[PDB]
Amino acid sequence: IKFELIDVPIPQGTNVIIGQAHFIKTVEDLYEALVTSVPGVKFGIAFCEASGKRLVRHEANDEELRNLAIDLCKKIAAGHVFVIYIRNAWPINVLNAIKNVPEVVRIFAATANPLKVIVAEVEPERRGVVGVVDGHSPLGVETEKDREERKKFLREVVKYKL
Amino acid sequence: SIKFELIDVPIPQGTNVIIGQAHFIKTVEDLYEALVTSVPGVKFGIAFCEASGKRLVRHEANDEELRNLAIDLCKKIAAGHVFVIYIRNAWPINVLNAIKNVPEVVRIFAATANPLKVIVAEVEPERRGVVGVVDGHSPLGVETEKDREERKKFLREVVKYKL
Amino acid sequence: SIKFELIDVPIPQGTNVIIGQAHFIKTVEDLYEALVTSVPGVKFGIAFCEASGKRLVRHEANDEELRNLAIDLCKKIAAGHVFVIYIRNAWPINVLNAIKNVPEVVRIFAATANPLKVIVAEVEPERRGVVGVVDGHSPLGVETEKDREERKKFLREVVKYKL
Amino acid sequence: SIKFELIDVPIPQGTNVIIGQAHFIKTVEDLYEALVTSVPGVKFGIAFCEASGKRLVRHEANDEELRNLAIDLCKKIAAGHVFVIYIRNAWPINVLNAIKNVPEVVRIFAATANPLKVIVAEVEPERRGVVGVVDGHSPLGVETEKDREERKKFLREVVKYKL
Amino acid sequence: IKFELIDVPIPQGTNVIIGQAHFIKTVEDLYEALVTSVPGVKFGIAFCEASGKRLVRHEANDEELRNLAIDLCKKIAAGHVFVIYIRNAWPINVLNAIKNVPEVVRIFAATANPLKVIVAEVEPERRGVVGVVDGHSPLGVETEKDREERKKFLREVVKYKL
Amino acid sequence: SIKFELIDVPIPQGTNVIIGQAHFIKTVEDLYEALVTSVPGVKFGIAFCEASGKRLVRHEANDEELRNLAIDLCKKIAAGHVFVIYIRNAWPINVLNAIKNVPEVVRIFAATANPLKVIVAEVEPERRGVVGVVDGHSPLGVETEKDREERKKFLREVVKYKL
Ligand SMILES: Nc1ncnc2c1ncn2[C@@H]1O[C@H](CO)[C@@H](O)[C@H]1O
Numbered sequence: 010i011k012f013e014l015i016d017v018p019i020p021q022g023t024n025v026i027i028g029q030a031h032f033i034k035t036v037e038d039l040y041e042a043l044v045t046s047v048p049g050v051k052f053g054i055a056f057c058e059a060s061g062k063r064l065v066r067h068e069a070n071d072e073e074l075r076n077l078a079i080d081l082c083k084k085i086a087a088g089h090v091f092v093i094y095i096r097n098a099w100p101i102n103v104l105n106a107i108k109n110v111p112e113v114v115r116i117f118a119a120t121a122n123p124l125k126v127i128v129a130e131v132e133p134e135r136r137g138v139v140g141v142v143d144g145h146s147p148l149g150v151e152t153e154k155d156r157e158e159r160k161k162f163l164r165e166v167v168k169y170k171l
Numbered sequence: 172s173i174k175f176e177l178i179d180v181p182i183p184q185g186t187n188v189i190i191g192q193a194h195f196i197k198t199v200e201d202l203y204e205a206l207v208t209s210v211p212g213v214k215f216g217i218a219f220c221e222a223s224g225k226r227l228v229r230h231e232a233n234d235e236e237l238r239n240l241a242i243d244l245c246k247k248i249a250a251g252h253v254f255v256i257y258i259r260n261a262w263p264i265n266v267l268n269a270i271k272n273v274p275e276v277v278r279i280f281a282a283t284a285n286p287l288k289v290i291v292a293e294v295e296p297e298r299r300g301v302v303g304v305v306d307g308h309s310p311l312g313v314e315t316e317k318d319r320e321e322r323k324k325f326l327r328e329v330v331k332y333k334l
Numbered sequence: 335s336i337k338f339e340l341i342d343v344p345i346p347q348g349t350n351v352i353i354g355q356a357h358f359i360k361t362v363e364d365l366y367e368a369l370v371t372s373v374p375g376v377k378f379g380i381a382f383c384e385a386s387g388k389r390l391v392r393h394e395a396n397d398e399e400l401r402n403l404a405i406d407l408c409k410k411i412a413a414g415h416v417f418v419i420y421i422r423n424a425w426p427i428n429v430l431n432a433i434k435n436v437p438e439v440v441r442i443f444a445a446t447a448n449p450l451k452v453i454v455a456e457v458e459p460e461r462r463g464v465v466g467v468v469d470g471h472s473p474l475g476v477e478t479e480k481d482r483e484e485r486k487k488f489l490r491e492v493v494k495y496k497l
Numbered sequence: 498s499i500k501f502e503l504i505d506v507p508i509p510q511g512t513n514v515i516i517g518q519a520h521f522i523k524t525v526e527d528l529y530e531a532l533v534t535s536v537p538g539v540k541f542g543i544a545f546c547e548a549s550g551k552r553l554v555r556h557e558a559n560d561e562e563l564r565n566l567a568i569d570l571c572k573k574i575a576a577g578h579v580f581v582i583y584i585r586n587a588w589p590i591n592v593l594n595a596i597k598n599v600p601e602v603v604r605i606f607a608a609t610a611n612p613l614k615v616i617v618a619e620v621e622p623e624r625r626g627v628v629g630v631v632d633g634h635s636p637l638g639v640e641t642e643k644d645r646e647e648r649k650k651f652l653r654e655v656v657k658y659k660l
Numbered sequence: 661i662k663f664e665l666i667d668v669p670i671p672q673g674t675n676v677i678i679g680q681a682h683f684i685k686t687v688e689d690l691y692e693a694l695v696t697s698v699p700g701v702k703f704g705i706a707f708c709e710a711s712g713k714r715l716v717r718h719e720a721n722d723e724e725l726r727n728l729a730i731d732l733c734k735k736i737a738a739g740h741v742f743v744i745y746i747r748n749a750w751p752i753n754v755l756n757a758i759k760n761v762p763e764v765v766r767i768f769a770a771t772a773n774p775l776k777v778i779v780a781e782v783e784p785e786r787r788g789v790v791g792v793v794d795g796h797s798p799l800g801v802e803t804e805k806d807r808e809e810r811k812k813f814l815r816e817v818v819k820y821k822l
Numbered sequence: 823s824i825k826f827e828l829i830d831v832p833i834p835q836g837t838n839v840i841i842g843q844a845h846f847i848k849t850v851e852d853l854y855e856a857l858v859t860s861v862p863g864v865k866f867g868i869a870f871c872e873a874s875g876k877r878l879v880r881h882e883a884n885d886e887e888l889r890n891l892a893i894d895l896c897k898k899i900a901a902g903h904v905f906v907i908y909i910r911n912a913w914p915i916n917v918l919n920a921i922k923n924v925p926e927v928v929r930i931f932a933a934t935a936n937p938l939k940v941i942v943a944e945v946e947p948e949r950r951g952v953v954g955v956v957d958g959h960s961p962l963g964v965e966t967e968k969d970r971e972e973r974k975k976f977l978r979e980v981v982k983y984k985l
Pocket residue numbers: 031032033060187262263264282283284285330
C-alpha cells in the first residue's frame with residue numbers, strides 16, 4: 010500500500026462534495042439532484058467509471074466547474090468516486106438529495122475549507138479513498154461568549170435559526 | 172503499530188456485493204427484511220460480525236451459495252460490526268436506499284460487481300476495522316461528446332432507466 | 335508523510351457514543367435538536383470540531399458528564415468537522431436516522447458502546463482525518479442454529495423488538 | 498348516495514393518537530416495530546383494518562388500556578386499511594418519521610392530543626373511507642410580536658427543543 | 661358540490677397506486693421510480709396535467725397497463741392526480757421511492773382490493789379527490805389464534821418476517 | 823349536518839402555495855428553517871393554526887406581502903393544525919422533501935401555482951378540517967406522441983431538469 014495526498018482546489022465561492030457511488034447512471038442522477046435543488050445553482054459533476062471504457066463522465070452547466078470536477082476525478086484516479094463543485098448553492102441546500110440517490114453509497118467531504126483526499130494505491134490502476142482532511146485541528150474549547158456569537162451569527166447574519 | 176491487509180472479494184457472475192458497518196444484533200434480521208421486501212424474486216445472503224459478547228458471525232439467507240460467500244467474507248474481513256450482502260436477481264439500486272434507512276446501518280463502503288478489495292487495519296490482536304475499498308479500476312481518460320451519446324443511448328434504449 | 339495515531343474511546347456503562355463527520359457550525363444546533371426531539375428524557379452531550387476561523391470544539395448538552403465526555407473526545411481526535419455525541423437513556427437506534435438526515439452531517443463512522451478506537455491520519459501538523467474505527471473485537475466463530483434461536487428469542491422475549 | 502358520519506376520538510390525558518391509511522397485513526407488525534424501536538419505555542397499542550379476507554381488526558400493544566382504545570377506534574371508523582395508534586411516554590414527534598417510512602403506510606390523517614373527529618364516508622353498507630379530520634378548534638386571532646416572544650421562550654426554556 | 665364515486669378496475673395480478681402531485685416532470689420521475697425499483701416490473705403511469713394543454717401524460721412498458729392508467733385518469737378527471745398500475749411488483753416494493761419524488765405531495769391508495777375513489781366536482785372542469793374506499797369494513801377483532809396464524813403467514817409463506 | 827365551504831386561494835405571478843396539516847407549535851419554526859435552508863434566495867411566508875389553548879395563527883416570514891397571504895389563508899380555512907406556505911424564488915420541488923421530513927408534518931394537501939380551491943368541512947361551531955383541494959382544471963384529452971416529444975424537449979431544452 011501507497012498513501013498519496015490529493016490536494017483539492019476550491020476557488021472562492023465554490024464548495025466541493027466528494028463521495029462514492031456506482032453504475033454509469035450516477036452522473037445523470039447527480040446532475041438531476043443538483044439541478045432540481047436550487048434554481049440558479051451552477052455546478053459540474055464528474056464520476057469515475059470503474060470498468061469497461063473506464064471514462065471520467067461529466068455533466069455541468071458551467072464550464073469552469075466542469076473542468077474542476079473532471080480534474081479532481083483524474084487526480085483522485087479511484088474507481089467510482091464522484092466529485093461535485095457548486096456555485097450559487099451551499100452543500101446543505103443539496104446534501105439530502107445527493108444522499109438519497111440510489112447509486113450513491115457514501116459521501117466523504119462537503120466543504121469549502123483547505124482539503125486533502127487520502128488515496129490508497131494497492132497496485133497500479135487500483136485505487137481507493139481511505140479518508141479526507143477537511144480543514145484544521147481545534148485550537149481550544151468554545152466559551153460562553155463564543156457560544157453567544159455563534160448563536161447570534163445563526164439568527165442575525167445567515168438567518169437559519171430564530 | 173498498525174497492519175494493513177488487502178482482501179479480495181469473490182464476485183460470481185450475476186452477483187453484486189454490498190459491504191457496510193452497522194451495530195446491534197438486530198442488524199441481521201432488519202437487513203434480511205430490507206432485502207426481501209424490496210424485489211419479489213430476490214436471492215441473497217447476509218452476514219454480520221457481532222463485535223462483543225459471544226462475537227459470532229450472524230447470518231440469514233434464502234440461497235446457500237450466497238449465504239456462504241457472505242460468511243466467508245466476514246470471516247476474512249473479521250472486523251467488528253461489519254456486514255456483507257451478496258445479491259442475485261436484484262441490482263443494488265433496487266435495494267440500497269432501504270439499507271441506508273435501516274436504523275442500525277451507520278455506513279456503506281461499497282456496492283458493485285467490479286474487481287474489489289477491502290483495506291482492513293488490524294491495530295491489535297483481534298481489533299480490526301475497515302479503512303476502505305478499492306472498487307474497480309482507475310480512469311483510462313475523459314468521456315468525449317460521442318462517448319456521452321452512447322451512454323445516453325445505453326440508459327434510454329438498452330436499460331431503459333431514462334427517457 | 336502520513337502518521338496514523340489511535341484514539342481509544344472511553345464509554346462509561348450506560349452511555350453510547352456516535353462519531354461522524356459534518357461541516358458548518360450549525361451542525362451543533364441541528365445535532366442537539368435531533369437528539370432532544372427524538373426521545374423524552376434523553377441525556378446527551380454533543381461536541382463539534384469547527385475546522386476553521388476560531389477553530390473551536392463547539393458543544394451543547396443537558397448533562398455535564400456527557401458534555402465533557404464529548405468535548406474531550408473531540409479534543410483527542412483533533413480532526414476538522416468531526417462530531418461526537420454521548421447518550422444515556424436512549425439507544426443509538428432511537429436517534430440515528432434523524433442524525434443521517436441532518437443536512438450538515440455527511441458520514442457516520444460508529445454508533446456503539448463497545449471498546450472502540452478511532453484511527454486518525456495526520457498529514458501535516460494541525461491537519462487530521464478520521465481514517466476508520468475499530469469497533470469491538472473480531473469474530474470468535476460462526477453462529478449455529480442454536481445460537482440463532484438464542485438471538486431470535488432475545489429479540490422477541492427480552493428487548494421485545496420483534497414479534 | 499353518500500352519507501357522511503362523524504366519529505369522536507377519546508384521548509385520555511397523557512396519550513396522543515395517530516390515525517392513517519396503509520395496506521397489507523404486515524402493516525401491524527411493521528408499526529409495532531416502528532414504535533418500540535423509537536423510544537425506550539413508550540407504551541402503546543396499535544390497530545389496523547384488514548380490508549379483504551377475514552377482515553379482522555389486527556393489533557399489537559405493550560399496554561391494554563392503549564390497545565383497547567385503538568381497537569375501538571378501528572371498529573367505529575370501520576374503514577378498510579385505516580390504522581390507529583395511541584401512545585404514552587412519547588410525543589408524535591418522537592415517532593412520525595419512522596411511521597411515514599413504513600413501506601405499507603400510504604398517508605397519515607392526524608397526530609394529536611387535541612379534541613378530534615374523523616369524517617367518514619359510507620358509499621354502501623360495509624364500504625367506508627376517511628374523508629378528513631377535525632383536529633382541535635379554529636383560530637381566535639393572529640399572534641402578536643408578544644405572543645411570539647412567549648412562544649420563543651416556551652420552545653427554548655420550557656421544552657428545550659430550540660436554543 | 662357534487663360527490664361522484666369512481667370504481668377502480670383491478671385485473672388479477674395488478675395493484676394500483678393513486679395519489680396527487682404537481683408539475684409535468686411528475687410523469688418521467690414516476691417512470692424512473694418504478695423502473696429502478698424492481699428489475700421485472702410492468703407498469704403504466706398517467707398524470708393529469710392541470711394547466712396549459714391540460715393533457716393526460718403517460719409512460720408505460722405494458723400497453724394494457726398503460727391504458728388502465730390513462731382510463732382511470734380520464735374518469736377521476738381531477739387536476740394533478742396520478743395513477744399507476746403494476747404487475748410483477750407489490751406496492752411495498754416501490755412506495756417509498758414514490759413518496760420521495762419531489763413532485764409527489766400525497767398518496768391516496770395503494771391496493772388490489774375492490775376500491776372506489778370519491779371525487780368532488782365543485783364547478784364544471786374543477787374536480788379534486790376527497791377520499792377513497794379501500795375494500796371493506798371489519799367483520800371482527802383478531803383472536804390470539806388469529807394472531808398466531810397471521811404471524812405464521814408472514815414468516816412461513818410470504819417470508820417477510822423471521 | 824355538515825357544511826362544506828370553498829376557499830379560493832390567491833396566487834400571485836411568481837409565488838407558489840404549499841398547503842398542509844401538522845400539529846404542535848414547533849411546526850412554525852421547523853417550517854421556517856426547512857425553507858431558509860433549502861434555497862439561498864427564497865422569499866416566503868409561513869402560517870399555522872394552533873388548534874388548542876390560545877388558538878393563534880402563528881407566522882414566520884421574510885416577505886411581508888407573502889406573510890399576509892399565508893396568515894389570511896389560515897384565517898379563511900380556520901381549520902385546526904393546517905399550515906400555508908407561500909414562496910418566491912424557489913419552486914415547490916426545491917423544498918418539498920424537506921417539508922415532508924419535519925417531524926410535526928403529518929400530510930401535504932397541495933403544491934401549486936394553478937387556480938386552486940380548498941374544501942373545508944365545518945362540523946359544529948369552530949370545528950373545521952380540510953376535506954380536499956381542487957388543483958387547476960380537469961383533462962382536455964390524452965397526450966399523443968407529438969405532444970410527448972414536445973414535453974420531453976421542454977424538460978431537456980427549456981428547463982434543463984432532464985438529459
Ligand atoms: N443494468 C444495471 N442496472 C443497475 N445496476 C447496474 C447495471 N449494470 C451494472 N450495474 C452496477 O453498476 C456497476 C458498474 O457497472 C456494476 O458493478 C453493478 O454493480
